[PDB]
Amino acid sequence: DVQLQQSGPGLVAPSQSLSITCTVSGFSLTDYGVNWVRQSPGKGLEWLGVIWGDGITDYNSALKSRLSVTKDNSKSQVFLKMNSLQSGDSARYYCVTGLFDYWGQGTTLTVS
Amino acid sequence: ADAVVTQESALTTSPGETVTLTCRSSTGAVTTSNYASWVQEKPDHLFTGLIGGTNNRAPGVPARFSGSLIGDKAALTITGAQTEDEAIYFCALWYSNHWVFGGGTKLTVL
Amino acid sequence: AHLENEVARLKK
């Protein structure tokens, strides 16, 4: 069994940003990648990005400029930062495994 | 820009019956390189992964859940549904450097 | 590939 725990201040306030930390258990960040996803009320899910074991990162082509995904392999952590937030960013943010098999409890973000 | 992933809006079944959820890609036939994956959303935004990479069950997932590719589309099949299987099903395809989620299929188990 | 690697993981 593997677990993913989300934390971090998150924040709020417009013009500023969101910051989330995802701690994994059951496997090392050196071997496999972690995804980030969000779902806004009434709307579907949308992939934000993934950070592979070797450090390479892939982003959502339309949000690329406003987000950063980094990780500390030794502390088994992955960080998500999204900036220049707007009302439309309000949603629930989740960190997930390589093929979306395991999920984190999610974090709710109310912007503005 | 990128592709559109399409799923049926609603589907209905009953205990013991069999049902098939599909996933279409706007770029053409779905393939093994799209690494089709399926996740189940239950009330309370409870997410669980079911199938990953076309036909692999995410450990701990009931064997009644299967996946494969049929006629240009990805498919999730529940052989012998149960009442708890009532939820929204999301499909996700991979396009070389990113994932695209389908709109979801609400499944009703009368 | 990264995916073929996640696949290897799911199969165990």
Our CA-based measurement puts residue A112 at a distance from the nearest CA of chain B, in whole angstroms, of 23
C-alpha separations of A5 from A61, A107, A109, B108 in Å: 26, 10, 16, 31
Give the Cα separation of A20 and A85 in Å (integer).
14
Q: Phi first, then psi: what are they for C10, rounded to 5°?
A: -60, -40
Domain A1-112 has CATH 3.30.420.10: no
Give the Cα separation of A38 and A45 in Å (integer).
6
Give, for A21, the enclosing helix (H) or strand (E).
Answer: strand A18-25
Tokens 């498919």, residue located: B75
Query: Residue B11 in contact with residue B108, Cβ under 8 Å?
Result: yes
Q: Phi first, then psi: what are they for B84, rounded to 5°?
A: -70, -25
Query: Residue B14 in contact with residue B34, Cβ under 8 Å?
Result: no
Our CA-based measurement puts residue B110 at a distance from the nearest CA of chain C, in whole angstroms, of 32
Give, for C6, the enclosing helix (H) or strand (E).
Answer: helix C2-10
Which of A40, A17, A22 has the alpha carbon at shortest distance from A97? A22
Give the Cα separation of A78 and A31 in Å (integer).
13
The amino acid occupying position B103 is G
Domains of chain B plus CATH, in order, are 1-110 (2.60.40.10)
Resolution in A: 2.3
Neighbours of chain C (3+ CB pairs under 8 A): A, B
SS3 C3: helix
Give the Cα separation of A112 and A90 in Å (integer).
8
Which of A18, A9, A6, A10 has the alpha carbon at shortest distance from A86? A18
Regarding beta strands B105-109 and B10-13, do their DSSP bridges make them parallel or antiparallel, or are they unpaired?
A: parallel
Among positive and negative, which fits the CA dihedral B88, B89, B91, B92?
positive
A·B CB contacts under 8 A:
57
Tell me how far the alpha carbon of residue A17 is from its chain's centroid. Answer: 13
SS3 B46: strand
Give the Cα separation of A104 and A36 in Å (integer).
10
Give the Cα separation of A5 and A21 in Å (integer).
8
Give the Cα separation of B71 and B68 in Å (integer).
10
Give the Cα separation of A18 and A16 in Å (integer).
7
C-alpha separations of B62 from B41, B51, B56, B57 in Å: 16, 11, 12, 8
Looking at the DSSP assignment, which residues form a beta bridge with residue A93? A38, A107
Domain limits, chain A: 1-112
The amino acid occupying position B38 is W
Which of A50, A2, A62 has the alpha carbon at shortest distance from A28? A2
Interface with C, mutate which of B33, B35, B37, B57 (most C CBs under 10 A): B35
Give the Cα separation of A5 and B64 in Å (integer).
29
Which of B88, B101, B109 has the alpha carbon at shortest distance from B17? B109
